[PDB]
């Protein structure tokens, strides 16, 4: 059973040594927040949260940073080396990468204004890593609502909150041009904008996204509050402003009877978002981890010990 207090007494000082890394990239890269979020979330949908996605290439297996949803996309890799060499000085081969990522995914919300909350610990590291099964598992922005329904729960995320809170992981972040081109100039075949987006904000993506333009482009997931972790995101839906087809079927989709509460009730009590993203956070963060004996505590969190 994982618990909060797994390293209380063999590293105390690990949720402190991790927050301070990430106030001082914060200072040069104002992103890297919303990018360890993202990372912990596709640790977790590949095998739980193993640290799997941290593993660079070797003869044997693929990395899994090569998958379509990891490639050119997952970002953040070189800080999460930093604290773990600033947290294997203070405590030699103690943390787990995989603990480090979650604790690292829970400090960057805090300090990036949302909730505080203390993780459960006690996860260690994967062997190997799982390319086919990040492919097969990774969620797309193109997804209709069942199929994100379905990915959630192919990973034991069974509960509608649980995809609506953790969706709020996009009220802060950047998304390239290329996952909203198909909703501005051409959405389902229909040669017509994706009728759930909001007029007047079609108008300004597609002066962000113009069409044969840069597709690398970045634009802001939450037009309100780009950096900050809040509710906001729930508020856009509402108005039909969710930046990609995922994010809006929430709110519209023919098949959200049971998300369009949610997302209403996160949208008009902070304390409501807050409660129901640590409940979902905190589920996902115990997809099946590698306890007890089980894996190692990874050293160089890019390749397996020997
Ligand atoms: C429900 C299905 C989801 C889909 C289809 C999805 C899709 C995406 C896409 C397309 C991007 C843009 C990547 C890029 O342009 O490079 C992205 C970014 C991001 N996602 Fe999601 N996501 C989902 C769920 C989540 C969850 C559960 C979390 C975390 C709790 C999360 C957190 C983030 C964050 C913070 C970013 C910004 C990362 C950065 O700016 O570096 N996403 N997501
Ligand atoms: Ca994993
Ligand atoms: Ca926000």
């Given at each position: 059973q994982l618990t909060p207090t797994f390293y209380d007494n063999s590293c105390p000082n690990v949720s402190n040594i991790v927050r301070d890394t990430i106030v001082n990239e914060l200072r040069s890269d104002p992103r890297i927040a919303a990018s360890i979020?993202?990372?912990?979330?596709?640790?977790?949908?590949?095998?739980?949260?193993?640290?799997?996605?941290?593993?660079?290439?070797?003869?044997?297996?693929?990395?899994?940073?090569?998958?379509?949803?990891?490639?050119?996309?997952?970002?953040?890799?070189?800080v999460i080396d930093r604290?773990?060499?600033?947290?294997?000085?203070?405590?030699?081969?103690?943390?787990?990468?995989?603990?480090?990522?979650?604790?690292?995914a829970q400090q960057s919300v805090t300090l990036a204004?949302?909730?505080?909350?203390?993780?459960?610990?006690?996860?260690?590291?994967?062997?190997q890593a799982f390319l086919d099964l990040?492919?097969?598992?990774?969620?797309?922005?193109?997804?209709?609502?069942?199929?994100?329904?379905?990915?959630?729960?192919?990973?034991?995320?069974?509960?509608?909150?649980?995809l609506v809170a953790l969706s709020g992981g996009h009220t802060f972040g950047k998304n390239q041009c290329?996952?909203?081109?198909?909703?501005?100039?051409?959405?389902?075949?229909?040669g017509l904008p994706d009728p759930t987006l909001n007029t007047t904000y079609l108008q300004t993506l597609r002066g962000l996204c113009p069409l044969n333009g840069n597709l690398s482009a970045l634009v802001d997931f939450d037009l309100r509050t780009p950096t900050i972790f809040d509710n906001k995101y729930y508020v856009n839906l509402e108005?039909?402003?969710?930046?990609?087809?995922?994010?809006?079927?929430?709110?519209?989709?023919?098949?959200?009877?049971?998300?369009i509460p949610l997302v209403r009730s996160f949208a008009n009590s902070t304390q409501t978002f807050f409660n129901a993203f640590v409940e979902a956070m905190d589920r996902m963060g115990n997809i099946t981890p590698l306890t007890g004996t089980q894996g190692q505590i990874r050293l160089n969190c890019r390749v397996v010990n020997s």
């Open positions: 979020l993202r990372l912990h979330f596709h640790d977790c949908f590949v095998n739980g949260c193993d640290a799997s996605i941290l593993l660079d290439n070797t003869t044997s297996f693929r990395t899994e940073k090569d998958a379509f949803g990891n490639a050119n996309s997952a970002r953040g890799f070189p604290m773990k060499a600033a947290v294997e000085s203070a405590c030699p081969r103690t943390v787990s990468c995989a603990d480090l990522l979650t604790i690292a204004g949302g909730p505080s909350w203390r993780v459960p610990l006690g996860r260690r590291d994967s062997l990040a492919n097969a598992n990774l969620p797309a922005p193109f997804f209709t609502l069942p199929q994100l329904k379905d990915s959630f729960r192919n990973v034991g995320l069974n509960r509608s909150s649980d290329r996952f909203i081109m198909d909703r501005l100039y051409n959405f389902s075949n229909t108005e039909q402003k969710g930046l990609i087809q995922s994010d809006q079927e929430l709110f519209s989709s023919p098949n959200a009877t049971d998300t």
